[model samples]
Target: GAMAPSYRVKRMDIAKNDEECVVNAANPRGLPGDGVCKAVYKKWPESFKNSATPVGTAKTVMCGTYPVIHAVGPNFSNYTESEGDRELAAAYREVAKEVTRLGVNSVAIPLLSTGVYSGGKDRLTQSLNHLFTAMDSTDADVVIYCRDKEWEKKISEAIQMRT
Candidate 1:
């Protein structure tokens, strides 16, 4: 098996990371508020807007440092478990496609639909499943950015990268 795509996990403020690309778990309605979204909106005030990005699509924006792709993950509070899973998978897949389209070498992403978004009790592992599954098919370098050390170790252990 070849590991040319580069997959790893790190603890950092994703908005402050130096990756060529960043993927935000954005609001499906394209509105920005609180948490990671707030950090992004803080840096780029005119982003998100009123457009609905849907649960399985993304909107790419040009930040000064790098391009940030807002991938709308499902708010599990408003969805069935199965539906939320599919939506989460779509969010990562959509963002990965955007990365390929933009031809970026590296990307930083968060565990979408979790924490403030109510990804349910099994959010971490379930979200990782979808995220890594999409990453397996993507052709870009991806780094899972955890805002705290709590998730950093867990994500790193789950990924098990040898490269």
Candidate 2:
């Protein structure tokens, strides 16, 4: 398998390594639960000044402890659609560069646009594929930490197929 997919339906405590950074596929505003190191979204609305930005809408704000970065494309309600997936892919790569600049080797991410937004599984898979693919092929593992078993299964499958 050029890219193998490994899914684990369990929760693993990410060891608190100050050298490692967590990545989450999320919007600029922190949605869902906390615990995400960095949040990456497609785009943010110019008027969106707070984290209360709508799902399909994008906003540039500080979410969690890490900084949030938005891509240039249309925002999806659930899964990303159209060329937005590509934009998301680019965003992930750029974010990876940012992470490297910060001297972090590992990053953790949650499913982006998978909740409340587009809900488009296929597009979400594609976005993940783009992100993983763009990441450096070193020992830098991109951890997809999910909130539940169902989500974990879906992410596991998606990563397996490279979206």
Candidate 3:
């Protein structure tokens, strides 16, 4: 049988979905300072408390069925081309690997390193490219959540071009 589509890149308001695991960006310290992390922390405090120290740039913490993958992203002040971009790619790859390990069929991921980290158009493009490539082979339904219409459009277009 032809395998069903293993991935989907979509633009949406929020990443929350009952059927999919959520992938959010976080700091290496395991702190949910603001943005998506803060909201996730508010909803699942124990998840963060119980999360293992991030071995590299990513950590997967379970909150029941919706395991939130916290991928540590670039800092706002000292972002760079080589270091930051590599870390971002690593996080996305880790998410795909963890998803396979957990035997989950669906996942929702935010554009990592955008908000508080404040990487503009270049960074957004870079992040999307890396994420799509990293999850290209994963046997799961991957959803890339966008913040607004603009981002949604941009990500959607990227996915179309990649396919």
Candidate 4:
């Protein structure tokens, strides 16, 4: 049988994407404090402020033509190591499910938990593993947006190892 068109790991800016959906790493309080969230919040403050919810849940906000998926990721300042990893994976899974349900063909996502959450490269790799696993059955095109070439290389290596 022919293989389906699965996701492609790309090195790009998530904020500058023209995809149908963009996934934002959000806190449990729905505050876009820094990094990509800050930029996203600046563009659509009301949606994020009004969509506050617990971690592991996702809220979709329409910004112009595309929908921004605010996924509540782990908190580096408060959560333990294991908890952070669990929450990050959960957030990825939730976002994938939500985007798939919305019939979104493509989604651009940052390396969740590695930013404000203070997660390191190991965490990034783990999160990507969980995300790719969860999204394997979905028809959506997943783009793992990296901050730089280092991250892009790391993620691309991980993707190659997985596929």
Candidate 5:
């Protein structure tokens, strides 16, 4: 099947605020301003209301004015190096769909399964490729924003290769 026809990636410290949706790469525990993760906390506080969930878990919750979903898998601080690798991508895909189902116009994504899960460049890129390819046809505008310049560059490069 032909891949979906539209998508782009850009580099910036401050993301364009994709309809107030924030995607974080953190555990259920808070890590404010540490990475692109700050976007999640800043934009959606209600998602974090349930502190009982541990790190590397995912949840779809209602934020102040929007539907904010948090995928806590594969953070560097938590989870064994081998734990989140196999399951992170699939979980993320499912959560992404849930987020879309919630009627979000935009989605901010972090590099899932990369750090603690030990997801390498190939794994990370492939996961992203699968995710975007599956979701691009939808009305939601997917934004893959990274916390650091290295990730920003990596994601942008990958997106260019595809689109």
Candidate 6:
């Protein structure tokens, strides 16, 4: 049995990355709430309406040539870390079909919900492992991006939590 490729980590601005599709850690409404979503939305001049997707789901919008996959990640600020972790897993699992259906060779991703959404260490571990497995079903290269200053430190922390 042939195995799907695993994700490769990268350090760069995902907004500037040339990947065919870029993931936006978005709100349930799929609006450019803040953080990565705002950056990507403002960087491109495309205006496409998005439907309201619930927590742990995703939708897409064509922003410039790079289609934006608006994945709604769990917001720990909403109360339960357990539910947030659950939602994060579901959100990561939703990406492969979303990108493969678009026929992309690769995609750029940020650590989902790690920004203002406030997902914690468990969410970090889940997004990394869950997304890695999720992309195994597709040919799309999952290129993870890091925006924080301490890139290596963060990636190490993420890798350590992968257990």
Residue-pair clash count for candidate 6: 0
Writing each residue's lDDT as its tens digit, candidate 2 over 20-60 gives: 44443444444433233232232222222444433323233
Error of 3 at 39 (Å): 2.1
Per-model TM-score versus the true fold: 0.88, 0.53, 0.84, 0.86, 0.66, 0.81
Model 3 Cα lDDT, one tens digit per residue, 1-163: 1156545556544434544677767777777678877777777666686564442367788777567777777764575667777777777888778777777777777777888775554467877778877887886777777657787777777767756
Which stretch of 10 consecutive residues in model 4 shows the poorest summed lDDT? 1-10
Q: lDDT of each model, Cα atoms only?
A: 0.77, 0.45, 0.70, 0.74, 0.57, 0.73
For model 5, how does the per-residue alpha-carbon lDDT over 51-120 read when each residue is reduced to its tens digit? 3345445566666666556666554344454564445655566665666667666665666655544433
Better of 1 and 6 by lDDT: 1
Q: Each model's RMSD to truth, in Å? A: 2.7, 7.9, 2.6, 2.8, 4.6, 3.5
Full-model lDDT, candidate 1: 0.77
lDDT of 6 by residue, 17-111 (tens): 86778888877765657777788767763733754588898787776566888788888888486787788888888877798888888888888
Q: What lDDT score is found at residue 146 in candidate 5?
A: 50
What is the Cα-based lDDT of residue 85 in candidate 6?
75
Q: How do the residues 1-163 of candidate 1 rate in per-residue lDDT, one tens digit apiece? A: 1248877887777778777877877887667666888787777655555435788788887765468788888888888988877888888888777887888878888888877777446488788888877777777778887766777788888878533
Which of the two, 1 or 3, has more TM-score? Answer: 1
- Lowest lDDT 10-mer window, candidate 6? 1-10
Runs in model 6 with CA error above 4 Å? 1-6, 45-48, 119-123, 149-163
Worst 10 residues of 5 by lDDT: 1-10
Q: Provide the lDDT at 136 for model 2.
A: 46
Query: For residues 1-163, could you state the per-residue lDDT of candidate 4 as single tens digits?
Result: 1135455666655667767788887876777678878877876666674667787678887766568888887766678878877877788778877887788777777767778676443466677777877777777777777767777788887777767
Best prediction by TM-score? 1
The count of residue-pair clashes in candidate 3 stands at: 0
lDDT for 126 (candidate 3): 76
Please give the ranking of all candidate structures by lDDT, highest first, separated by commas: 1, 4, 6, 3, 5, 2
Candidate with better lDDT, 3 vs 6: 6
